[PDB]
Design a protein around this ligand. Structure first.
Ligand SMILES: CCCCCCCCCCCCCCCCCC(=O)OC[C@H](COP(=O)([O-])OCC(O)COP(=O)([O-])OC[C@@H](COC(=O)CCCCCCCCCCCCCCCCC)OC(=O)CCCCCCCCCCCCCCCCC)OC(=O)CCCCCCCCCCCCCCCCC
Ligand SMILES: CCCCCCCCCCCCCCCCCC(=O)OC[C@H](COP(=O)([O-])OCC(O)COP(=O)([O-])OC[C@@H](COC(=O)CCCCCCCCCCCCCCCCC)OC(=O)CCCCCCCCCCCCCCCCC)OC(=O)CCCCCCCCCCCCCCCCC
Ligand SMILES: CCCCCCCCCCCCCCCCCC(=O)OC[C@H](COP(=O)([O-])OC[C@H](O)COP(=O)([O-])OC[C@H](COC(=O)CCCCCCCCCCCCCCCCC)OC(=O)CCCCCCCCCCCCCCCCC)OC(=O)CCCCCCCCCCCCCCCCC
Ligand SMILES: CCCCCCCCCCCCCCCCCC(=O)OC[C@H](COP(=O)([O-])OCC[N+](C)(C)C)OC(=O)CCCCCCCCCCCCCCCCC
Ligand SMILES: CCCCCCCCCCCCCCCCCC(=O)OC[C@H](COP(=O)([O-])OCC[N+](C)(C)C)OC(=O)CCCCCCCCCCCCCCCCC
Ligand SMILES: CCCCCCCCCCCCCCCCCC(=O)OC[C@H](COP(=O)([O-])OCC[N+](C)(C)C)OC(=O)CCCCCCCCCCCCCCCCC
Ligand SMILES: CCCCCCCCCCCCCCCCCC(=O)OC[C@H](COP(=O)(O)OCCN)OC(=O)CCCCCCCCCCCCCCCCC
Ligand SMILES: CCCCCCCCCCCCCCCCCC(=O)OC[C@H](COP(=O)(O)OCCN)OC(=O)CCCCCCCCCCCCCCCCC
Ligand SMILES: CCCCCCCCCCCCCCCCCC(=O)OC[C@H](COP(=O)(O)OCCN)OC(=O)CCCCCCCCCCCCCCCCC
Lengths: 100, 65, 120, 459, 331, 31, 63, 171, 50
């Protein structure tokens, strides 16, 4: 024969001793307070107020500013006859070149 | 069913023997496509870079990449 | 490396010029970490003798914390002293050998030419 | 970042001093409070990163990874409290302490300003993960799987240690903020070739690269549910985060060193997806799908265009949520039938209709249904690889067929057809399980409304 | 202006309101199918006003109302194109869907999941009007994949049947093979034109439009079940008769034809694309009508009928008559 | 489930072939 | 399943309805700001560069 | 509203309704019903809310970044100055991106508004679009995901060397 | 306190937040000294940021 071993325990059903079990614990008061903690601090706090926070971020990575600033610059240079964007990012007067 | 899944997963390597057929099939289906797609994509990108640095490829409105 | 510096006054843990250095504060985070190591030593000492881990031997846990803070304060003084000696010898050697440490001309990027490598 | 490090450390006395019926509820509550506080990282700027100190900083790459990391701990606590209900109390507290310690290593992995502190936290993440797999895994093979997970990572990463200390000696620093401004072009040589390999292969193992992926369908299968969630949702993304930090230093040599690995990924995402067509183990099917999705992130980092980095960080966040939800669904069946065989329990929509709706939504986000951020990352990587080479769309599009085919076959085998007659322990879905599914899926669908926070440093 | 765009968006939001009603339920509904049928009747009546004032003046517009996502130079906005194609196809689809759902209130009367059936059928209608009112390729891809997934869920309605799951996965397979070409088209237009919007695609008007039009033809071959990607539309008769009647006769299956009709400024200048469309449509309308001659399942015969008529639609696109093709859709 | 009901190596001796056929619940003539 | 969906909708609406009512009260009674030119010599605070009141509250309070 | 010169609109010319038939169009009846039942109550609610806005009026500002020295006049490996130059360059890159977005909005609005004669009537918008895309492509294309002011300066110097060699070999 | 354990994580937040603010005063080398943001001090003000 083989050694001294406990037999395989059965898988428990949380609905037999507690038909209103939420799956958290076998103590029903602990189970229901675990449910309320998960649903309040997960859905009522992080999801709702978190989506409110993400929805009202103060110009996340300043895109809106960059629209409005662009709305300045075009409006500055539609008038003065300047081209809307130079192809050179830096002034060629302040660039030394390697001669040849 | 347990025997089927243990054959399909766990018994594969302990009953593997490297020989002629397994080496030719593992090098044919293992690195053959790697060599193939390497030379296809390298040829396409060398052709593309050679067109771009000569001013031949129409990259006019291409400012997203 | 610095074996000749601490050889004219041998076996001094803290020399006299270490007193010219500011000592570590008693609220040093390194010293508080060593106190935490003492507290963990007290907890392991209660655990290996099967005492109640947080409750038993508060005099013993407090002597663990006290001994690690006490030893670690001097260890931090010696650490700060040796890095101070390191920088002092570095700077005196740089000052004493200007032929080896030239002041390099910092060129601006309008003159500096770098090869561009396009990602495409 | 010390406003996130100290609450994560205070979760240790919070979990060791709680009452025996209270150690799940308190940790879940306060980890949700830490995850609520994690949104203060969203103070990101168009020009500068959010640079807290000499040690810690956060740009828009690390910020979604940090919010996902701090969000995954309550979900791991919810997932792992049923199957550890019969556990000893001290071992249960040690399990929770390993998850807390892993989160503590992860949040200062992603915020390490200096790259050797990144390496130390990046390799400190092995020890809680290894202990969790080899201690609370279910089957025999967890010891072997822990060995594979350990010794692929360390064999890839101990060259990375030498490489980072070499950059430390050459440049004088491993500050990422300094190395943004002192980076030198890395010329073509054999020295720089093995420099590139030593910088990249540790993260290739972490992604995983195809061919190096053999640790993953063991380590993600032989683990408990919290281990699979943190492995497939966060720990595969350390590789992508590390590549996006380290390819700054590897130019212009990457522009031809990437060519084999791109092939290994572009063919790899064809193979591993195809492997998901013929897997019997559902957890292994989710594992090979993880390899298939992370191959796109490897390609997008190695082609190093802006659209590719945006799609790669979107696809990493989206795959984190999706694959974590899929592992939780596979556990929701495995807690009932006690076998990971996918053909065993069929027709489960006849018995669990709301859970079948969760399976449906997870499989639709798995197959990159628009406008989910799964599809946003998928589509942007496809755009950037089309700009890389116009032929790759074939290998993309064929993948986008097979990605559909295993995502619905998994839905058809598990949930559809006639149910298995001899299985009669299929309980109704507990409120904990559907709570876990909703906390996976509702953030994933809300991020479709505002995807710009998960698009990375160059939105 | 203020009437046109208002009732335009009121049609779509009115369709989305019973989805909120079925998702916010606690009770057993007092005839939710009657509620959805009344909703679609009213949506048809609402959509007839912008149709009448398009018959009056020819009033087209664009509602780019919600800025969604700017990828550095690609501004994806929630953009709705009210032109001739939307103004005619939206009331026809609403009228047909209203008839299909009053049919479904009888044909599916014994079904205990009838509210799920009307939920899925309304979600199909919402995604199809997302498809046909779209102004950029991303939102059109949303409607495209949406009608593909609602096709999956409505073919595999009796999910215990193996053949329904098999035909649904078949339909998804052929549609994703078409989606390869659709994403090829989106990729070409983004890389070469920096846009997914239809207006910039039509204004730049490229002459090297071989590859994107081949991608769009592959997308239409997937979606409209042309030759090579045809058999899923006869296989799709496994779903209920309102599924085979709304989705697989009139509304979803014309989306590939509608996609090629939508890009008529590009097909009118590509004779090679017109030749490929003409040959593929003639091949499809021959082959499916020939297969229809000997079938005995009546839904298979009518499915080969509608695939033959889709092939005829592809023919009349291929002879540079896109408006006759769209008239044949609405007919 | 136990080890000698799991799949094993390739059978060569006829008693090993018969033990395999008994393991997979089929005849030796059909194995 | 019905108990879960009732609890899900309840714990969403529990803070969702007061936040929607509060956002309505802010948009009606507090109100969206108006774009002005910077005066001469005046240094605006960093939260005075944002338009919505909740965004100004976030930029003043936390960021 | 917005600035009517950066987003220009041509003058609307609608024809006077000249009905030839004897049947009444339903569109005028529906226009009056929309004016009564919809436009007036929406107008009243908006006037109520706007009075509530005017009861407490406060202002937000456009942030003005003064120009700092760019990457050319920063010394090599001098992080305190080249950091400021890099932040300046990144803000300019984001703003140039939105300039391209403005010109794309102009082109698409012109195409829809002109309708069928869009190919003739939108030549100026097409020309401005081609110029601004050529400028953006010369300035920022092919830099990579690890772009910087140094990358853009190196691309500009390579382009200027190519232009100088092409000029000199043509003389 | 009957619920002393429910302040271990929030106080550990605030203290941590406190230390973050305390670190900012050690990184105040270039306060009102950068070329972008340097300006004259307004009256009743001693530092630009804290
Ligand atoms: C703190 C860390 C060290 C603690 C050591 C002692 C722990 C212990 O005994 O806990 C038990 C005790 C509760 O149990 P008990 O009933 O008292 O007695 C033990 C039972 O009999 C337990 O029942 P049992 O013994 O009959 O059987 C169960 C079994 C269960 O065990 C098993 O079944 C076998 C193993 C299971 C799987 C393995 C799990 C993982 C274990 C290894 C951890 C590795 C990760 C660490 C980091 C990665 C690198 C390796 O064994 C135990 O549970 C034994 C107790 C030890 C558990 C905890 C171990 C902690 C030490 C190791 C980690 C820390 C040090 C290394 C760190 C490395 C680098 C960071 O827990 C505590 O008291 C925890 C501390 C709570 C209060 C914390 C307050 C902190 C205050 C800080 C500020 C104040 C100081 C300021 C200083 C500065 C002043 C200036
Ligand atoms: C009601 C219950 C609703 C549900 C509650 C529970 C919801 C669940 C929990 C949610 C928890 C929070 C989650 C985070 C949300 C945070 C808020 C947020 O993100 O807001 C964003 C966004 C911006 O809000 P904001 O930044 O605060 O305001 C910006 C303004 O510049 C500044 O604001 P303003 O001052 O300019 O705005 C004024 C506005 C105040 O603004 C608000 O209240 C906006 C905040 C509402 C947020 C609601 C979000 C909840 C989700 C809504 C969507 C799902 C609803 C359920 C399903 C519906 C069907 C789909 O004033 C009014 O509301 C009054 C106007 C009333 C008009 C109607 C009646 C007029 C005639 C009356 C005649 C009778 C009386 C005459 C005499 C009167 C004498 C006094 O707000 C919205 O998007 C509001 C929702 C409605 C948008 C338009 C809807 C139509 C769009 C149609 C085309 C597009 C769709 C096409 C689809 C096609 C089919 C496929
Ligand atoms: C900022 C505020 C935002 C407010 C608005 C919310 C925005 C979206 C949030 C998520 C919405 C869906 C949530 C419910 C689904 C999961 C649970 C479920 O299945 O319940 C069934 C259950 C009703 O079924 P039942 O009969 O009781 O039992 C279920 C059956 O046993 C068996 O069930 P079944 O199979 O018969 O029914 C499942 C059916 C199955 O149908 C499908 O699977 C077909 C769906 C795909 C094709 C159609 C959609 C294609 C995309 C177009 C739509 C998006 C763009 C539209 C715009 C125009 C174009 C651009 O799905 C639905 O009925 C759901 C319709 C909506 C699906 C959304 C797309 C999911 C597909 C995968 C991702 C694709 C991209 C997502 C983009 C999201 C953008 C926001 O619904 C509920 O009890 C609802 C519970 C409350 C839900 C709250 C949702 C918001 C939570 C956020 C909280 C924090 C923020 C505060 C806002 C609160 C607002 C109230
Ligand atoms: C982030 C990385 C980690 C990921 C996991 C994180 C988990 C932890 C949770 C953290 C908090 C939550 C994070 C995500 C929040 C995302 C939500 C959010 O902020 O959204 C902002 C977006 C912001 O959009 P916006 O940018 O337009 O907002 C304008 C900006 N303000 C408000 C300042 C003027 O919110 C909305 O869009 C809200 C719009 C109203 C509500 C939605 C209406 C439409 C819903 C569908 C209707 C039906 C249509 C047809 C379909 C029919 C059915 C198929
Ligand atoms: C996942 C498992 C596989 C992991 C693979 C990891 C990467 C593969 C290559 C690793 C090579 C070793 C680390 C290289 C570090 C380079 C740092 C550096 O300064 O390089 C430039 C230096 C150059 O020297 P230098 O820089 O001092 O010289 C001065 C500069 N010049 C050249 C101008 C004079 O490279 C070297 O010194 C040698 C580099 C190659 C080293 C080969 C020995 C290791 C053999 C392969 C080990 C592979 C993994 C082992 C584990 C396998 C599984 C068990
Ligand atoms: C029952 C609830 C309804 C509301 C009841 C209470 C209010 C009563 C009536 C008054 C109306 C509410 C006040 C006015 C509304 C808000 C006005 C406003 O300026 O809002 C700010 C803005 C308007 O857009 P915006 O352009 O000003 O801001 C976008 C933000 N930036 C610029 C930073 C990008 O947001 C909204 O209005 C959000 C509404 C969204 C509605 C549609 C959602 C579709 C969801 C699909 C998601 C995925 C799409 C992917 C594809 C996109 C296309 C490619
Ligand atoms: C060649 C050849 O014949 O290899 C066979 C050899 C074993 O020799 P055998 O055929 O048994 O005599 O087998 C061997 O020598 C071992 C295998 C040879 C090397 C194979 C290399 C490719 C394997 C697949 C790699 C996939 C990546
Ligand atoms: C525990 C620490 C206790 C220290 C007590 C004092 C010991 C002492 O005075 O040691 C002298 C030594 C410095 O003497 P030095 O001649 O510099 O040593 C060169 C060694 N190669 O100083 C030291 O070695 C100090 C460091 C001792 C550290 C011991 C624990 C590690
Ligand atoms: C197996 C599991 C799945 C895979 C996991 C990942 C494993 C592989 C990781 C490394 C992949 C190979 C190394 C990277 C390839 C880079 C390109 C390359 O080496 O091309 C072949 C090379 C062409 O020559 P060239 O590159 O010009 O060399 C001169 C360098 N100045 O040709 C030559 O120079 C001739 C050959 C030289 C020998 C190279 C040996 C070292 C590299 C392989 C190790």
């Amino acid at each position: 024969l083989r050694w001294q071993e406990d037999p395989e325990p059965e898988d428990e059903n949380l609905y037999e001793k507690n038909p209103d079990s939420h799956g958290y614990d076998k103590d029903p008061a602990v189970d229901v307070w675990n449910m309320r903690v998960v649903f309040f601090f997960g859905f009522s706090i992080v999801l709702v107020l978190g989506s409110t926070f993400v929805a009202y971020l103060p110009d996340y990575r300043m895109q809106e500013w960059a629209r409005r600033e662009a709305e300045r610059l075009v409006k500055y240079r539609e008038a003065h006859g300047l081209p809307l964007m130079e192809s050179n990012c830096f002034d060629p007067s302040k660039i030394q070149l390697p001669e040849d | 069913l347990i025997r089927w899944t243990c054959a399909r997963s766990a018994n594969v390597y302990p009953n593997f023997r490297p020989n002629t057929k397994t080496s030719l099939l593992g090098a044919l289906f293992g690195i053959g496509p790697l060599i193939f797609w390497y030379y296809v994509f390298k040829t396409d990108r060398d052709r593309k870079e050679k067109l771009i640095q000569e001013g031949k490829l129409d990259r006019t409105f291409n400012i997203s990449y | 490396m610095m074996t000749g510096r601490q050889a004219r006054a041998p076996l001094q843990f803290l020399p006299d010029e270490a007193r010219s250095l500011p000592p570590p504060k008693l609220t040093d985070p390194r010293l508080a970490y060593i106190g935490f190591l003492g507290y963990c030593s007290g907890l392991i000492d209660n655990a290996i003798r099967r005492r109640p881990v947080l409750s038993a031997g508060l005099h013993r846990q407090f002597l663990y914390i006290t001994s690690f803070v006490f030893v670690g304060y001097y260890l931090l003084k010696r650490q700060d002293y040796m890095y101070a000696v390191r920088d002092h010898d570095m700077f005196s050697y740089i000052k004493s050998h200007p032929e080896d440490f030239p002041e390099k001309d910092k060129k601006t990027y309008r003159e500096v030419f770098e090869e561009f490598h396009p990602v495409r | 970042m010390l406003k996130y490090i100290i609450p994560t450390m205070m979760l240790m006395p919070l979990t060791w001093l709680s009452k025996n019926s209270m150690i799940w509820i308190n940790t879940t509550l306060h980890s949700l409070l830490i995850s609520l506080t994690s949104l203060l990282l969203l103070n990101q700027f168009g020009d500068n990163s959010l640079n807290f100190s000499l040690t810690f900083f956060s740009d828009s790459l690390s910020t979604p990874l940090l919010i996902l990391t701090m969000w995954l701990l309550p979900l791991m606590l919810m997932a792992s409290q049923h199957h550890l209900s019969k556990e000893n109390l001290a071992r249960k507290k040690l399990f929770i302490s390993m998850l807390i310690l892993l989160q503590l290593f992860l949040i200062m992995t992603f915020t390490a300003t200096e790259l050797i502190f990144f390496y130390i936290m990046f390799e400190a993440t092995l020890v809680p993960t290894l202990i969790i797999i080899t201690r609370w895994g279910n089957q025999t093979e967890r010891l072997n799987a822990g060995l594979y997970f350990l010794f692929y990572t360390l064999a890839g990463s101990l060259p990375l240690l030498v490489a980072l200390i070499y950059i430390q000696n050459t440049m004088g620093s491993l500050n990422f903020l300094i190395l943004q401004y002192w980076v030198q072009p890395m010329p073509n040589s054999w020295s720089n070739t093995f420099m590139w390999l030593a910088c990249m292969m540790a993260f290739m193992v972490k992604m995983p690269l195809y061919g190096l992926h053999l640790w993953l369908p063991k380590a993600h299968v032989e683990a408990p549910i919290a281990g699979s969630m943190v492995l497939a949702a966060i720990l595969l993304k350390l590789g992508g985060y590390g590549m996006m930090r380290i390819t700054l230093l590897l130019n212009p040599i990457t522009d031809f060193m990437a060519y084999p690995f791109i092939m290994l990924s572009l063919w790899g995402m064809i193979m591993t997806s195809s492997i998901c067509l013929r897997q019997t183990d559902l957890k292994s099917l989710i594992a090979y799908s993880s390899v298939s999705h992370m191959a796109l992130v490897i390609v997008a980092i190695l082609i190093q265009t802006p659209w590719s980095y945006m799609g790669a960080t979107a696809l990493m966040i989206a795959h984190g949520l999706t694959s974590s939800m899929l592992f939780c669904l596979a556990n929701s069946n495995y807690e009932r039938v006690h076998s990971r065989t996918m053909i065993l329990a069929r027709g489960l929509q006849t018995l669990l209709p709301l859970m079948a709706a969760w399976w449906l939504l997870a499989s639709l986000t798995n197959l990159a249904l628009p406008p989910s951020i799964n599809l946003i990352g998928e589509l942007f990587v496809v755009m950037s690889t089309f700009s890389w080479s116009n032929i790759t769309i074939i290998l993309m599009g064929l993948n986008m067929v097979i990605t559909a085919l295993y995502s619905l076959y998994m839905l058809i085998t598990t949930q559809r057809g006639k149910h298995t007659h001899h299985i009669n322990n299929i309980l109704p879905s507990f409120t904990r399980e559907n709570a876990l599914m909703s906390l996976h899926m509702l953030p994933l669908l809300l991020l479709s409304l505002n995807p710009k926070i998960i698009l990375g440093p160059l939105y | 202006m203020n009437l046109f765009s208002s009732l335009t968006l009121v049609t779509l939001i009115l369709l989305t309101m019973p989805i909120a009603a079925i998702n916010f339920n606690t009770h057993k509904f007092t005839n939710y199918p009657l509620y959805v049928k009344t909703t679609i009747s009213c949506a048809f009546i609402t959509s007839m006003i912008p149709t009448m004032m398009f018959i009056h003046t020819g009033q087209e517009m664009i509602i780019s109302n919600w800025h969604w996502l700017t990828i550095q130079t690609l501004k994806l906005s929630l953009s709705f194109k009210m032109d001739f194609f939307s103004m005619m196809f939206v009331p026809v689809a609403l009228f047909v869907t209203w008839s299909i759902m009053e049919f479904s209130m009888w044909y599916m009367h014994s079904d205990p999941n009838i509210n799920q059936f009307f939920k899925y059928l309304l979600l199909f209608l919402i995604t199809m009007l997302i498809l046909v009112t779209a102004n950029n390729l991303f939102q059109l891809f949303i409607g495209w994949e949406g009608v593909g997934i609602m096709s999956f869920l409505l073919i595999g309605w009796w999910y215990g049947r193996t053949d329904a799951n098999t035909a649904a996965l078949q339909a998804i397979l052929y549609n994703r093979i078409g989606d390869i070409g659709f994403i090829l088209a989106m990729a070409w237009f983004l890389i070469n034109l920096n846009t997914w919007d239809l207006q910039q695609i039509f204004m730049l008007n490229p002459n090297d439009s071989n590859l994107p039009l081949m991608g769009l033809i592959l997308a239409a071959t997937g979606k409209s079940a042309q030759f090579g990607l045809h058999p899923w539309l006869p296989s799709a008769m496994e779903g209920p008769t309102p599924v085979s009647a709304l989705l697989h006769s009139s509304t979803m299956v014309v989306a590939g034809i509608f996609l090629l009709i939508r890009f008529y400024p590009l097909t009118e200048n590509n004779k090679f694309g017109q030749s490929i469309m003409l040959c593929l449509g003639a091949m499809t309308t021959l082959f499916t009508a020939m297969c229809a001659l000997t079938q005995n399942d009546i839904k298979k015969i009518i499915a080969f009928s509608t695939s033959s008529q889709l092939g005829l639609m592809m023919v009349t696109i291929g002879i540079n008559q896109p408006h006759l093709a769209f008239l044949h859709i609405c007919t | 489930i136990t080890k000698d009901m799991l799949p094993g190596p390739y059978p060569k001796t006829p008693e090993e072939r018969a033990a395999a056929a008994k393991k997979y619940n089929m005849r030796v003539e059909d194995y | 399943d019905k108990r879960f969906l009732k609890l899900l909708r309840f714990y969403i609406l529990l803070t969702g309805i007061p936040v929607v009512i509060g956002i309505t009260l802010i948009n009606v009674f507090i109100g969206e700001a108006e774009l002005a030119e910077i005066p001469e010599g005046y240094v605006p605070e960093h939260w005075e560069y944002f338009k919505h009141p909740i965004s100004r509250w976030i930029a003043r309070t936390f960021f | 509203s917005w600035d009517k010169d950066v987003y220009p609109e041509p003058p609307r010319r609608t024809p006077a309704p000249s009905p030839q038939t004897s049947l009444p169009n339903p569109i005028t009846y529906l226009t009056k019903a929309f004016d009564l039942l919809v436009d007036r109550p929406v107008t009243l609610v908006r006037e109520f809310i706007e009075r509530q806005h005017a009861k407490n009026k406060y202002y937000y500002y456009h942030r003005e970044f003064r120009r700092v020295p760019d990457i050319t006049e920063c010394h090599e490996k001098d992080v305190l100055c080249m950091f400021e130059a890099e932040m300046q360059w990144k803000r300019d890159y984001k703003v140039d991106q939105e300039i391209v977005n403005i010109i794309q909005e102009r082109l698409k609005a012109c195409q829809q508004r002109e309708g069928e004669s869009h190919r003739q009537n939108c030549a100026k918008e097409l020309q401005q679009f081609t110029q601004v895309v050529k400028a953006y492509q010369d300035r920022y294309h092919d830099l990579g995901a690890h772009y910087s002011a140094r990358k853009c300066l190196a691309k500009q110097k390579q382009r200027m060397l190519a232009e100088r060699k092409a000029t000199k070999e043509a003389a | 306190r009957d619920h002393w354990i429910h302040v271990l994580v929030p106080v550990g937040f605030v203290f941590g937040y406190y230390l973050d603010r305390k670190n900012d005063e050690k990184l105040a080398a270039f306060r009102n000294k950068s070329l972008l943001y340097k300006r004259e001090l307004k009256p009743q003000e001693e530092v630009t940021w804290k």
